[PDB]
Amino acid sequence: LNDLCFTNVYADSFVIRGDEVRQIAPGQTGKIADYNYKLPDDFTGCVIA
Amino acid sequence: GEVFNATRFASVYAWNRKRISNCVADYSVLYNSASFSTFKCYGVSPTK
Hints:
Chain A: This is Spike protein S1. The structure is cut from a larger assembly and holds 2 copies of chain A. By secondary structure, chain A is mostly loops. Helices cover 10% and strands 0% of the residues of chain A. Chain A has 1 helix and no strands. Chain A has one helix at 31-35.
């Protein structure tokens, strides 16, 4: 990613319970996935926890 | 109910099986009661 130039980037930062770290994956469903936040299946981006 | 929270689960060497049939199946009421960390499903999406 150091060798690519970006058109535009968005940074979404928020607090998650230790056990729910794998709920933000595309296609993955659950309580916070369905009622709080979920991202499109064809998502291009990197996650840092 | 009996498969999500029993007195004590049968060991892996003598794992418990029963046929379930002639009823209606839904996950919403009981999944959140016993909260889980590894749900990986192969043939079927949880919503379908």
